[PDB]
């Protein structure tokens, strides 16, 4: 029995494994998934940049950042509204880095963007044009969350 | 060895409970859960009363219930046309309860309603512009489901 | 004891196997299925029948396929623009049959469709009002899986 049982139940673990990672498949094509590209979503909840990364990362997934125009025009299609962008200046002022660590290798910047506005502007939305605006952390914008390809 | 092979076995199904939470949460969130705020979903089809209740149940949620004016109109937004609410007087006539227990606190009457109409109406569907109209539980109204925040 | 542990393995895979099951009906409620009803998914990426085919089987459905007016309403809506079906009339010409077997019996072919156009046309794509037309193989087209009632 209990040697048994106990291969039994590795193969039923295995298949379990197998099951969710369809799930998790049949999931990100219903999402709008495309064949080997990222995929950003959204709640279409606005919010403070800490929390947006909070959230994506109890997710698993990271503040959406677009590497080219394609990724860009992605994100703003799926956030239809401003969202944070996974992109501060917050450790250097005036330079902006990823939250997944390294300098900026693509920027849309709105024009004389950006320029810590006022009190302070340490975080990135991307605007209803693609366009880039430094914006407070503090300030409420959409959630979008990426994944990888 | 059979320790070890069991309590690695042990550790893969606690890994794999974490990834299923893991997708229920990303599933949640892609169909616009909003944070610390009930779950709302629809298929889109309308149905009795009883159905929707057992529908509901199987999935280990419960009809949609509005506890206030903001979760009423979240539920507006997700029914598009007229749904049941998980709320019925069939106990006391006047006297609305909700399926899970307790009276009734927010509501959100049209005018002239509710007038448990002709034959009867113990069931309760939210309409146009959110607002409530008593109907008879017999009739098929879109089926909401509401899980917890 | 080893024995112990071996049975509260046994009850944490059947929870699991539960809990992937409840995951999997409130995905697909979420997605649209309506009870007793087969549903329609679509990532809205356009490609070849023959990777909407691989893509779909990898899900463990099959290419959408209308066997009724409703179904293909159905389609119509999920798909909003032109996409491939799984019939073909690739083993035979002009003898169109269902990927998973059987001669085609419903049909909504527009006006003088089928034609196996030019070097020929062996899929089908649903289109404009839902109706279809013959169309090559190779083309890209919107991919639309089926999953069972
Ligand atoms: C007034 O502050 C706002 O507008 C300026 C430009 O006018 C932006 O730079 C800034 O981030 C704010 O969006
Ligand atoms: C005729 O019955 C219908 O219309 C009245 C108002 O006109 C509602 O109160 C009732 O529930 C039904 O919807
Ligand atoms: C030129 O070919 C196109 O148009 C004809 C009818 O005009 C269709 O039958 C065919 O599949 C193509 O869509
Ligand atoms: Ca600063
Ligand atoms: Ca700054
Ligand atoms: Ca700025
Ligand atoms: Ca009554
Ligand atoms: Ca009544
Ligand atoms: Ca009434
Ligand atoms: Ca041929
Ligand atoms: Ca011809
Ligand atoms: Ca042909
Ligand atoms: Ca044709
Ligand atoms: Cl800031
Ligand atoms: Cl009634
Ligand atoms: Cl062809």
Same mark, same amino acid.
């Given at each position: ?11 039923? !673990?295995?298949?379990?494994? %197998?099951? @969710?990672? @369809? ?5 990100? *094509? $219903? ?9 950003? #979503? ?7 940049? $800490? ?5 994506? %990362?109890? /997710? =698993?997934?990271? +503040?959406? !950042?677009?590497?080219?125009?394609? &990724?860009?025009?992605? !994100?703003?299609? #799926?956030?239809?509204? %401003?969202?944070?962008?996974? !992109?501060?200046?917050?450790?250097? &002022?005036?330079? *902006? ?5 390294? =300098? ?16 302070? &502007?340490?975080? +990135?939305?991307? #605007?209803?044009?693609? /366009?880039?605006?430094?914006? $407070?952390?503090?300030? %409420?914008?959409?959630? #979008? ?5």
């Amino acid at each position: 029995a209990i040697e048994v049982k106990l291969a039994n139940m590795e193969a039923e !673990i295995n298949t379990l494994k %197998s099951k @969710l990672e @369809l799930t998790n498949k049949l999931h990100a *094509f $219903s999402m709008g998934k495309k064949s080997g590209k990222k995929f950003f #979503v959204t709640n279409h909840e606005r919010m403070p940049f $800490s929390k947006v990364k909070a959230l994506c %990362s109890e /997710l =698993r997934g990271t +503040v959406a !950042i677009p590497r080219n125009a394609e &990724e860009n025009k992605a !994100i703003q299609e #799926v956030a239809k509204t %401003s969202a944070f962008l996974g !992109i501060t200046d917050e450790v250097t &002022e005036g330079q *902006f880095m990823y939250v997944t660590g390294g =300098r900026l290798t693509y920027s849309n910047w709105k024009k004389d963007e950006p320029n810590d506005h006022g009190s302070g &502007e340490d975080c +990135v939305t991307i #605007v209803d044009n693609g /366009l880039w605006n430094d914006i $407070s952390c503090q300030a %409420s914008h959409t959630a #979008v969350c990426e994944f990888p390809a």
